[PDB]
Design a protein around this ligand. Structure first.
Ligand SMILES: Nc1ncnc2c1ncn2[C@@H]1O[C@H](COP(=O)(O)OS(=O)(=O)O)[C@@H](O)[C@H]1O
Ligand code: SF4
Length: 214
């Protein structure tokens, strides 16, 4: 394939974690681009849930035409797809609509309707984890917008590491960022934001598995 060897990937992740200690998001993205850029012709990808365009704006500022994957499980909001289209049309980013092999009606007919209500782990595996893994096969590193304030279990989220689920380098530039940080960035850069985030939505994901404000 077109992915670096697993020991090489681990040594690169360790070197990046040790070298990017206390670096800004732009510095981490520049390191990722300089390491996995050549040999479009990009060898790293960015993942965005279309809740905002902060990570997308940063990745486009450090690499015009950077690929950005979006996991379209089929249960998304109309506002989420609208935000995806807006980010694609506005920013200099090549988006990828990663879809599962089975549609919503196909899965409802094969394994029963509303799999999220009966077995949510299998639904998330079939529609999110498996397509993400099938897409990441080929990229030596992938960038995520995970922040250490998202959950108490994410407090020790590392800057650069080796994801053992897909076996490749995982880099989180927005890890050290807080709510005030992302607010100030959205204000100073005028980045697109999902309309549901403006309406008081804590998180943005699949419609049946998203905590409603009310
Ligand atoms: N549907 C998705 N499509 C693409 N990337 C996603 C998606 N969901 C999560 N991610 C990636 O993981 C990060 C979000 O992690 P979480 O805090 O756990 O929020 S959540 O939407 O996935 O539940 C995003 O920044 C993104 O890089
Ligand atoms: S969030 Fe819910 S609907 Fe979306 S893939 Fe996971 S279980 Fe299925």
């Amino acid at each position: 394939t077109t992915r670096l060897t697993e020991p090489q990937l681990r040594e690169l992740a360790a070197r990046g974690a040790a070298e990017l200690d206390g670096a800004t998001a732009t510095d981490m993205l520049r390191w990722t681009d300089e390491t996995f850029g050549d040999i479009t012709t990009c060898n790293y990808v960015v993942a965005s849930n279309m809740a905002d365009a902060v990570l997308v704006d940063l990745a486009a500022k450090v690499r015009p035409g950077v690929p950005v994957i979006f996991l379209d499980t089929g249960y998304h909001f109309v506002e989420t797809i609208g935000t995806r289209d807006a980010i694609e049309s506005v920013y200099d980013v090549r988006v990828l609509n990663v879809t599962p092999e089975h549609t919503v009606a196909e899965q409802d007919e094969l394994l029963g309707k509303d799999l999220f209500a009966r077995n949510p782990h299998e639904c998330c595996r079939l529609r999110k984890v498996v397509p993400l893994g099938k897409t990441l096969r080929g990229y030596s590193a992938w960038v995520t917008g995970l922040r250490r304030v998202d959950a108490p279990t994410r407090a020790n989220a590392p800057l650069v590491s080796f994801d053992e689920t897909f076996k490749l380098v995982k880099v989180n530039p927005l890890a050290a960022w807080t709510d005030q940080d992302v607010q100030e960035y959205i204000a100073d850069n005028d980045v697109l934001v999902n309309p549901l985030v403006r309406e008081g939505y804590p998180s943005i994901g699949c419609a049946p598995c998203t905590a409603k404000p009310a």
